[PDB]
Write a protein that binds this ligand. Structure first.
Ligand SMILES: [Fe+3]
Ligand SMILES: [Fe+3]
Lengths: 104, 215, 252, 112, 57, 181, 549, 224
């Protein structure tokens, strides 16, 4: 349709995050997750904040024919109850943090 | 952006049941702080701007995973609704169509009063107590919600509000929430406001019965 | 006649409509149902044998509680529950004994045993309740059921569903079956008959080896698989089919 | 019989109550007209029931180091015995092992 | 049979083909395994290697 | 759950529901101051005397008896009265005895149409040869679905004549498929 | 009785006694068939209907009444039965308005001066000001004091300037999109072609809460009344079904109304972008049938139902509840990339083996300089096929692997290092076993990262559960996971006593019996008659071996 | 039968930071009512005889909270709250607590800002906790084969209403009551000033250090 997937699925993105925002969030203390070329299905049970450090991911929501693309330097918030498929085609590295209600 | 609406009465008009100092902090500090915080958030998102107030509350509620703007947007509506739920020389009993709907949906006004009181006494922590009009069921109900939640997020039409956040009664009653509830039902609740809110709600619910031809 | 469920209504001697529904198996087995004068449903297996619906249903593992809930007229079903019947229905094993008493018409109280079920299964359920693929299709479409096409055997709901329509048939909901319609018939060609003879011939060969296997064991001799198998069960089964079966005819 | 798919309508002269409580049969005390309003059939269409709603407009039709063990699966580079159909049922042997420690060349009987 | 009169023997011809092509297996697979009283000796048929030999005459 | 899963982005008809029917062209067919203009008058504001965030604006016969407060009887009006509040809070009326409103696009006053104090009717059923006028083609059977200024859209329907004692198989609005009794 | 059933038909099934305009033949059929079959007609209605079977008699009857033929033709299309009580619309005080720019200005993707926009947006705080009816008299401006130049409309004029600039730059594009998306015109669509007139208001000119004067243009029995409010889209008042039986007496085509905008929506997704209610006349008491949701289009690009329902406000597609709590499930640690690492591990090991066996092939070439064979398609790394094993045929999958994605420099050093230890063990009369290699260690560290990710989600989930249970917030997505009996009264339940067929023993021809006998033969061809001495799990039969070794 | 213990200081000893009027209502009415109502819900039930910590875990019921949980958890929370403050509090901690704080928050100044912000943003009634996270999960495959010893860390967590970190098997070390009754008689709506006063004048770091030793010993006993 005309509406972008990010708007439809409430996927907040903050492309080209400044270092100030990273330190406000305390990203340097976040856990690390990495992968190579693979395919990860996931249903988010809580919100997750992801800061991509290397590579890129294409996110295909359940039943979708389009994808959302996030690149290194982007800060992504995956919402609770989102069901999607994550696709990687090259080395990928991220720092993540899961957020409960309130929190951040 | 939203302005801070003044209550429909002077700040000392609810004395001695609700003190002037309570109104000054409750409206002048709490309600004002909610409006100011919401306006900052709306100035950064053009999409949340442009929603109506009811639409914004439903949209930011996000079907049970509320967005950061929900608490401010819900609270500004809740407090605006609350000041209009009260009037000087309020209390006693409703009349005309409000009384008949209450007697139909609760059995009697006495039954409604206990249901409203028990909901207000058993709401743990901060929250609100509502007399609502059910859209699908076409009847009145007593509902209690926690923190900033209001019946708009479930497409219900509020009729009467009571704030049971501690900041609304602690200066005048301290821990005696039951006295605060009893005073609200006896001297403050505006049944005149409920008449107009029921009239506005009847543009969407139709609590009447159809005229069916014998043909 | 094709396997399936057929809803008839015959007039009695007094001109009162009585509605009957019959289940036909892939073997021609008929499990007839009926509505009597007192509205008591009977499973007529023969002209002299009658079985109540509740006894038959409970012997198949359906408890009394679900039957009432899933029928459109539970008050009708409860109205015929005698005190004696209720105690037997309460257990699956006792219902089987009650079913055997009515089905066999033998005076006495049978004792539950594995051999009794095996004898009962072949005489009744192997002959009468094996719908097959054609019967399952006809049962499903006629009774409006979403049951997978792979289930070739009768289910308790299929029997229960037949009871429901029978009542609703008496009260003007639906239409009676036409037995002479070709959609209720089926054609058995040379493939069906030659396959029956092969199946009949393979049942004989199994017992031919069973007799020969015992003989070799009684003599402590090693039997060659050949000596255990003789050709006559397959040769003579087909010469006898072609010579004696009324559907095998000398070509004009 | 109905000449076309559609919904039933009557205005007057049909009893609103059914002939019997369970049934959908209505009597006519007077002469009347029964109307069949034409409409297309859903047929074998799915109908989602969460997005298809009243008055919607449809513009579209309806050696161990080489092996691996994972969730409900494993890979193997002990002789493997697979059934003829390639299908295992519950409690199925797929690999046996002949330990040389129990191998014998002399005859006898076994006691345990 | 869609644009000509079918062969008058077609029903017999297709039926016999179905018996050879599918009918044999359905019956040869219903043959039970034969075991004795003592279960010492067991006889079975390997149906997947069933064969039909052309007539000698 | 999605995580337990054991295509690569890198490589007509209108629904009628109450039971579904499709309405389309196969069963519906057509039978063939400044000057006042329609448009917005502005945004109605809350009147504090009536307690409602969104103004009531009007009552009907039933709601005026149920929900009208005693102190508001003096404010019930039979005709419309128009007031304008500017951005500084000043109240304007121009003529407080007529119906004058401001056009928000042209920014001028104009009169309302009224002061607010056809042959074929919607939903009627037609027979197959009913005459609406001598100079007009005969109508077709069906129900009037849409009424416009100079045309009507008909949903095709077929009547069946039934005599007393006949039995109808189906409740009202029951879907009947082709060939059903 | 025949009073509740009639009421039930009206309320539940939408019955109404709609007028049937009959021909003389149809009128005669209903009046005469009530008397008998072949009998002298006696009732004055049937006798008159018999006479009316001749149009010549009708013309004589019409002339005697002094009316024209066309008037008689119009009298048959008259509403029969009683009339509803006539409307009495009372005004709840005066109509007081402001000129407030729409909150949603400007449209998405249109750039305006943000300084002018903030000046425009100041007017939105004016809604908070209180107005009392006892106060609209003290300083009322009338006559010469109420001319337009006297009013402060500066913030609305800046909106008008921005609105006109947007209209001139987007008018043609919007009309082109209407033709591309909407094949035929319909009320609620964009007015285009010859019917378009310059000066029609675009959608961003409207906002909920605005009061409009308009005319009724279209009545739809299943949709409602469509009102022209001066725009390029007609407004829509939702009325449907039985309500029109009485409402048709009051809402007529061409009449002037006062309406209020209740909702404004995107015309690409919603059929009727402007939703209205009648202010004058007030018909709130006559409307009983409500739309659950505003109707939408299902368009060419709408292939995902979950995306469609998010574009509107519609609930998710319901599912059967799993019956298991997500916070009680075991953690996930199988990293999806491990399956790829395993493929690379096997590719390196078999390349190393060939290097040992046939080193003459690997002369003068560094293993890091190896290239794939001519024909290597990177897009065909997975080839599906089938293979025959003896008589059994199992499908076989081919996993193509590149040589340039392998680290053969590190593998060779590891391979040579382990060969030396194997040789040293052999020289001592001892055996050597390799416990794991670098790639196996690489698989565990990817698993550890995945396990940590699952642990952190579960820990946050446990806190999230306690917060939501305390504040009465949903644990599952609302609308998802409907309970039982929602999906139908009849469902095949193999476990249920109403769908079981082995009551009197498992059938010998049943699929269960055939499968059970099949694996008995498969096992017996391996084991036979031996007694089960003692059984142990594989996992507990590995530790004990490690302990003994 | 649980008993309402008095605070470990005279009711006038927190002046002027926390008035006697606040303590008269917070302890004498709110906390007293929680204990009184809890004793009515336990008498004659199986909750008799267990410690308050056991009652809180049992009544939580894995999220489907039983009627006694609100009284039981609040009674525990307030007893913990009174021990978290002293008449001469504030300042800085030392010892192993200061080492752990700097390890997990960078510096003490960084921790104070993060703790104050969490207490300020806690919407509605609730509590803000400094906890020692050494939890174990009751699910499968939830044990780390190779612990890193940095997994037992300090965290700042917010809870609503009566919830406390005990229900997730955390070890609370410090709390501040952000229910409005805790500060409304002294600061009215000014919750920021109340939080700042708590961290500068009231917090008892020696008690927090003492609670950390028991939490560390709790984890040590589990690991052996
Ligand atoms: Fe408040
Ligand atoms: Fe407290």
């Amino acid at each position: 349709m005309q509406t972008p997937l990010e708007e439809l699925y409430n996927v907040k993105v903050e492309r080209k995050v400044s270092q100030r925002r990273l330190e406000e969030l305390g990203v340097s203390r976040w856990s690390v997750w990495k992968t190579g070329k693979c395919k990860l299905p996931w249903d988010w049970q809580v919100d997750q904040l992801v800061y991509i450090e290397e590579g890129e991911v294409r996110v295909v929501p359940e039943g979708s024919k389009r994808f959302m693309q996030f690149l290194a330097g982007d800060l992504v918030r995956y919402p609770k109850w989102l069901e999607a498929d994550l696709f990687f085609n090259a080395p990928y590295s991220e720092r993540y943090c899961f957020k409960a209600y309130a929190d951040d | 952006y939203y302005g801070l609406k003044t209550p429909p009465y002077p700040l000392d008009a609810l004395e001695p049941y609700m003190s002037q100092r309570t109104l000054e902090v409750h409206w002048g500090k709490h309600h004002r702080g909610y409006v100011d915080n919401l306006n900052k958030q709306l100035g950064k998102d053009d999409r949340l701007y442009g929603y109506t107030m009811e639409e914004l509350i439903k949209a930011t509620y996000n079907n049970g995973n509320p967005l950061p703007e929900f608490n401010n947007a819900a609270q500004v509506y809740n407090h605006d609704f609350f000041w209009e739920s009260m009037q000087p020389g309020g209390g006693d009993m409703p009349i005309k169509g409000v009384l008949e709907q209450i007697e139909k949906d609760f059995g009697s006004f006495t039954n409604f009063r206990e249901k409203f009181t028990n909901a207000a006494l058993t709401q743990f922590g901060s929250g609100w107590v509502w007399l609502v009009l059910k859209r699908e069921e076409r009847r009145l109900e007593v509902v209690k919600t926690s923190n900033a939640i209001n019946p708009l997020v479930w497409d219900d039409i509020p009729i009467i509000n009571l704030d049971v956040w501690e900041h609304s009664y602690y200066l005048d009653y301290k821990n005696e929430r039951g006295k605060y509830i009893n005073t609200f039902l006896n001297h403050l609740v505006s049944w005149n406001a409920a008449m107009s809110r029921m009239a506005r709600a009847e543009a969407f619910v139709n609590l009447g019965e159809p005229t069916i031809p014998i043909a | 006649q094709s396997p399936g469920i057929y809803y008839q209504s015959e007039l009695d001697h007094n001109g009162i409509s009585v509605y009957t529904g019959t289940i036909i198996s892939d073997w021609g087995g008929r499990l007839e149902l009926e509505i009597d004068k007192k509205a008591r449903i009977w499973a007529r297996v023969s002209r002299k044998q009658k079985i109540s619906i509740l006894v038959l249903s409970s012997a198949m593992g359906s408890n009394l509680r679900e039957i009432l809930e899933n029928v459109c007229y539970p008050e009708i079903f409860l109205s015929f529950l005698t005190d004696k019947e209720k105690k037997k229905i309460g257990s699956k094993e006792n219902a089987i004994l009650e079913f055997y008493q009515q089905f066999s018409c033998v005076g006495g109280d049978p004792i539950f045993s594995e051999s009794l079920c095996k004898e009962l299964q072949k005489k009744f359920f192997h002959q009468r309740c094996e719908l097959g693929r054609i019967g399952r299709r006809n049962i499903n479409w006629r009774l409006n059921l979403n049951i997978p096409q792979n289930n070739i055997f009768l289910l308790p709901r299929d029997i229960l569903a037949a009871a429901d329509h029978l009542i609703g048939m008496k009260f003007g909901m639906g239409t009676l079956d036409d037995m002479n319609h070709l959609k209720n018939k089926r054609i058995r060609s040379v493939a069906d008959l030659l396959q029956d003879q092969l199946g009949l011939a393979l049942a004989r060969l199994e017992n031919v080896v069973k007799g020969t296997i015992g003989g070799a064991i009684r003599h402590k001799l090693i039997p060659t698989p050949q000596n255990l198998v003789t050709s006559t069960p397959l040769t003579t089964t087909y010469e006898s089919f072609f010579g004696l079966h009324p559907l095998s005819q000398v070509l004009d | 019989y109905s000449d076309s798919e559609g919904e039933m309508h009557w205005s007057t002269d049909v009893s609103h109550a059914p002939e019997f409580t369970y049934s959908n049969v209505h009597l006519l005390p007077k002469t009347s007209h029964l109307w069949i309003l034409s409409g297309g059939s859903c047929g074998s269409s799915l109908i989602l029931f969460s997005i298809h709603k009243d008055q919607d407009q449809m513009n579209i039709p309806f050696s161990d180091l080489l092996a691996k063990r994972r969730r409900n699966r494993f890979l193997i580079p002990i002789s493997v015995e697979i059934p003829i159909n390639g299908i295992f049922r519950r409690n199925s042997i797929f690999a046996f092992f002949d330990d040389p420690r129990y191998r014998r060349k002399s005859s006898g009987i076994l006691k345990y | 049979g869609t644009s000509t009169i079918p062969g008058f023997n077609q029903i017999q011809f297709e039926g016999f083909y179905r018996f050879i092509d599918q009918g044999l297996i359905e019956e040869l697979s219903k043959f039970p395994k034969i075991e004795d009283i003592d279960h010492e000796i067991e006889f079975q048929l390997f149906v997947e290697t069933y064969q039909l030999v052309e007539p000698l005459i | 759950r999605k995580r337990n899963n054991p295509m690569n982005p890198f490589y007509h008809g209108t629904i009628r529901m109450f039971s579904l029917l499709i309405l389309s062209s196969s069963n519906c067919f057509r039978i063939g101051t400044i000057k006042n203009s329609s448009g917005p008058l502005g945004t109605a504001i809350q009147i504090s005397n009536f307690y409602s965030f969104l103004p009531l604006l009007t009552y009907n016969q039933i709601s005026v008896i149920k929900y009208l407060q005693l102190d508001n009887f003096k404010y019930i009006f039979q005709v419309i009265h128009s007031y304008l509040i500017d951005e500084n809070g000043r109240i304007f009326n121009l003529d407080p005895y007529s119906n004058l409103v401001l056009n928000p696009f042209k920014l001028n006053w104009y009169f309302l149409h009224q002061n607010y104090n056809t042959i074929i009717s919607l939903g009627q059923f037609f027979c197959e040869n009913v005459c609406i006028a001598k100079k007009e083609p005969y109508l077709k059977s069906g129900q009037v679905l849409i009424v416009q200024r100079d045309s009507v859209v008909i949903r095709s329907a077929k009547p069946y004549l039934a005599t007393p004692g006949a039995k109808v198989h189906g409740h009202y609005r029951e879907i009947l498929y082709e060939g059903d009794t | 009785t025949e009073d509740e059933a009639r009421r039930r038909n009206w309320i539940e099934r939408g019955w109404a006694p709609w007028e049937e305009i009959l021909t003389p033949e149809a009128d005669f059929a209903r009046k005469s068939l009530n008397e008998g079959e072949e009998v002298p007609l006696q009732s004055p209605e049937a006798i008159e209907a018999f006479k009316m079977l001749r149009p010549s008699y009708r013309k004589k009857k019409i002339k005697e009444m002094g009316i024209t033929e066309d008037e008689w033709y119009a009298k048959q299309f008259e509403i029969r039965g009683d009339k509803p009580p006539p409307l009495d619309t009372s005004w709840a005080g005066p109509l007081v308005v402001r000129q407030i720019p729409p909150r949603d200005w400007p449209p998405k993707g249109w750039e305006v001066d943000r300084k002018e926009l903030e000046f425009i947006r100041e007017a939105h705080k004016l809604m908070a000001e209180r107005v009392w009816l006892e106060d609209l008299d003290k300083d009322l401006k009338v006559g010469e004091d109420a001319t337009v130049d006297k009013m402060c409309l500066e913030r609305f004029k800046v909106f008008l300037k921005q609105y006109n600039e947007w209209v001139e730059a987007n008018k043609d594009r919007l009309e082109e999109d209407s033709y591309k998306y909407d094949q035929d015109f319909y009320p609620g669509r964009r007015i285009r072609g010859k019917d378009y007139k310059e000066g029609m208001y675009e959608l961003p000119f409207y906002y909920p809460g605005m009061i409009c004067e308009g005319t009724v243009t279209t009545l739809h029995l299943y949709q409602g009344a469509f009102v022209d409010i001066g725009g390029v889209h007609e407004g829509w008042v939702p009325i449907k079904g039985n309500d029109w039986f009485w409402i048709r007496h009051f809402i007529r085509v061409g009449m002037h109304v006062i309406v209020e905008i209740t909702a404004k929506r995107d015309p690409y997704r919603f059929r009727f972008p402007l939703e209205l209610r009648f202010v004058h006349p007030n018909i709130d008491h006559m409307i009983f049938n409500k739309f659950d949701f505003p109707p939408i289009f299902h368009r060419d690009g709408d292939t995902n139902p979950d995306e469609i329902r998010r574009d509107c406000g519609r609930p998710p597609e319901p599912r059967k509840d799993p019956g298991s709590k997500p916070e009680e499930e075991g953690l996930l640690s199988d990293h999806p990339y491990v399956d790829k690492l395993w493929q690379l591990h096997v590719a390196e090991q078999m390349i190393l083996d060939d290097y040992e066996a046939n080193p003459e092939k690997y002369k003068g070439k560094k293993l890091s300089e190896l290239s794939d064979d001519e024909g290597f398609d990177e897009r065909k790394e997975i080839e599906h096929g089938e293979a025959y094993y003896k008589k059994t045929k199992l499908p076989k999958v081919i996993l193509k692997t590149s040589v340039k994605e392998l680290d053969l420099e590190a593998a060779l050093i590891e391979r040579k290092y382990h060969n030396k230890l194997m040789m040293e063990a052999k020289a001592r009369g001892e055996g050597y076993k390799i416990e794991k290699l670098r790639r196996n260690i690489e698989m565990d560290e990817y698993d550890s990262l995945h396990w940590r990710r699952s642990l952190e989600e579960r820990e946050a989930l446990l806190r999230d559960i306690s917060s939501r249970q305390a504040l009465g917030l949903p644990l599952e997505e609302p609308g998802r996971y409907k309970p039982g009996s929602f999906f139908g009264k009849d469902q095949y339940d193999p476990t249920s006593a109403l769908y079981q067929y082995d009551y009197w023993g498992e059938p010998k021809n049943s699929e269960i019996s055939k499968q059970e006998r099949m694996k008995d033969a498969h096992n017996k061809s391996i084991v036979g008659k031996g007694n089960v001495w003692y059984d142990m799990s594989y996992d507990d039969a590995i530790k004990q071996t490690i302990e003994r070794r | 039968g649980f008993e309402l213990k008095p605070p470990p200081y005279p009711l006038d000893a927190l002046e002027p930071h926390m008035s006697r009027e606040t303590l008269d209502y917070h302890w004498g009415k709110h906390h007293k009512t929680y204990v009184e109502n809890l004793n009515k819900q336990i008498v004659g039930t199986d909750l008799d005889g267990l410690s308050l910590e056991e009652v809180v875990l049992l009544s939580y019921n894995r999220g489907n909270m039983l009627p006694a949980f609100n009284n039981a958890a609040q009674a525990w929370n307030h007893e913990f709250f009174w021990e978290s403050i002293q008449p001469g509090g504030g300042g800085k901690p030392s010892g192993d607590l200061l080492r752990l704080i700097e390890r997990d928050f960078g510096s003490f100044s960084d921790f104070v800002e993060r703790f104050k912000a969490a207490a300020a943003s806690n919407f509605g009634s609730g509590w803000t906790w400094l906890a020692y996270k050494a939890n174990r999960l009751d699910v499968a495959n939830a044990v780390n084969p190779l612990p890193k010893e940095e997994d037992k860390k300090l965290v700042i967590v917010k809870t609503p209403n009566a919830v406390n970190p005990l229900v997730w098997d955390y070890s609370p070390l410090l709390t501040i009551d952000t229910w409005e009754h805790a500060y409304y008689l002294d600061f009215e709506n000014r919750r920021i000033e109340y939080i700042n006063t708590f961290m500068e004048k009231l917090v008892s770091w020696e008690t927090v250090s003492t609670r950390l030793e028991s939490a560390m010993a709790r984890a040590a006993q589990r690991e052996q």
